[PDB]
Amino acid sequence: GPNCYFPLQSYGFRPTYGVGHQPYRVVVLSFELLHAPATVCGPKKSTN
Amino acid sequence: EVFNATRFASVYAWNRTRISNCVADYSVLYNFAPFFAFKCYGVSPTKLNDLCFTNVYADSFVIKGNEVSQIAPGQTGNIADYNYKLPDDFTGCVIA
């Protein structure tokens, strides 16, 4: 009727599509280097 | 005259609907006909009256229903490879 539509459109992840249309898996790492107390970094030798 | 014509030309031979030097207020026509398959990829105006632009390259088509999946920016298929290819940066309204 009106412009109403379901606001979720399925992606046709076909294997025959081109490389620019082949689905990509994305992982994003977000961190804030602001707070003075830290909890995680790589290992380094300590000193007195 | 373009939006409500009884007969168009060939679907591959789109009509030069040059929308220039006027107010492209075609949003009222949304109420004239039940626009289904509504896919505005770059701009989605429910009203359109301000900006002036040089080129519009508007097109007129007559197609089926279960074929709009090939109507998308940078898409491949029967329409793109045989009738009309939509650019990767296709910013326009496909109104079927």
Curated annotation (Swiss-Prot), chain A:
Q: Which domain of life is it from?
A: Viruses
Region (Disordered), start-end ranges: 35-48
Subunit organization: Binds to host ACE2. RBD also interacts with the N-linked glycan on 'Asn-90' of ACE2. Cleavage of S generates a polybasic C-terminal sequence on S1 that binds to host Neuropilin-1 (NRP1) and Neuropilin-2 (NRP2) receptors. Interacts with host integrin alpha-5/beta-1 (ITGA5:ITGB1) and with ACE2 in complex with integrin alpha-5/beta-1 (ITGA5:ITGB1). May interact via cytoplasmic c-terminus with M protein. May interact (via N-terminus) with host bilirubin and biliverdin, thereby preventing antibody binding to the SARS-CoV-2 spike NTD via an allosteric mechanism.
Task: State the function annotated in the UniProt record.
Answer: Attaches the virion to the cell membrane by interacting with host receptor, initiating the infection. The major receptor is host ACE2. When S2/S2' has been cleaved, binding to the receptor triggers direct fusion at the cell membrane. When S2/S2' has not been cleaved, binding to the receptor results in internalization of the virus by endocytosis using host TFRC and GRM2 and leading to fusion of the virion membrane with the host endosomal membrane. Alternatively, may use NRP1/NRP2 and integrin as entry receptors.
Which protein, by its recorded name, is this? Answer: Spike protein S1
The species this protein belongs to is Severe acute respiratory syndrome coronavirus 2
- Lineage of origin: Viruses, Riboviria, Orthornavirae, Pisuviricota, Pisoniviricetes
